């Protein structure tokens, strides 16, 4: 895979977090995030993918040891963590062709693990529209509270 970078972006409270939504196979809610192009630096590529799926600059606010990365089937992803912006900030997508929907969503109402179908006897996991975010939250979770208490 090659590798993968954006952003979470938490507004004043620390309370809530700004997710995007896609289409078909990227049909759920995630972290702003895109594939980093030949010879492009990673705070760069961060910048650049959050800007044209949320219309929001970040790269005055990026800092360099700020990020949470994680390696899912052997493809690096690394969010940026993008603390105090403003609930009342206008965001708007560059291209609409794959972004639906943009949303600030509270931090601790959010999934961290999807539910299984032991109910049911059935092995694997129920869906979940949440499913590109949920790896990130228990990492941010204690993140936040080394940073902050
Ligand atoms: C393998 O390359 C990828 C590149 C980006 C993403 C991603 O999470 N996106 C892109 C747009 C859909 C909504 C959520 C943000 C996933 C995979």
């Given at each position: 895979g090659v590798p993968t970078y954006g952003a979470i972006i938490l507004d004043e409270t620390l309370e809530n977090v700004?997710?995007?939504?896609?289409?078909?196979?990227?049909?759920?809610?995630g972290f702003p995030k895109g594939k980093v192009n030949?010879?492009?630096?990673?705070?760069?590529?961060?910048?650049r993918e959050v800007f044209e799926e949320?219309?929001?600059?970040?790269?005055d606010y990026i800092c360099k040891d700020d990020y949470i990365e994680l390696r899912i089937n052997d493809q690096?992803?690394?969010?940026?963590?993008?603390?105090?912006?403003?609930k009342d900030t206008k965001f708007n997508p560059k291209t609409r062709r794959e972004i639906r929907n943009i949303e600030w969503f509270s931090i601790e109402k959010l999934p961290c693990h999807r539910n299984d179908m032991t109910p049911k006897?059935?092995?694997?996991?129920?869906?979940?529209?949440?499913?590109?975010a949920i790896p990130?939250?228990?990492?941010?979770?204690?993140w936040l509270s080394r940073r902050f208490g």
């Open positions: 700004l997710l995007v939504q896609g289409y078909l196979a990227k049909s759920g809610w030949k010879e492009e630096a990673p705070h760069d590529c961060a910048a949320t219309g929001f600059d970040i790269k690096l992803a690394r969010l940026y963590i993008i603390p105090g912006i403003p006897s059935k092995l694997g996991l129920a869906p979940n529209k949440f499913f590109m990130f939250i228990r990492p941010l979770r204690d």
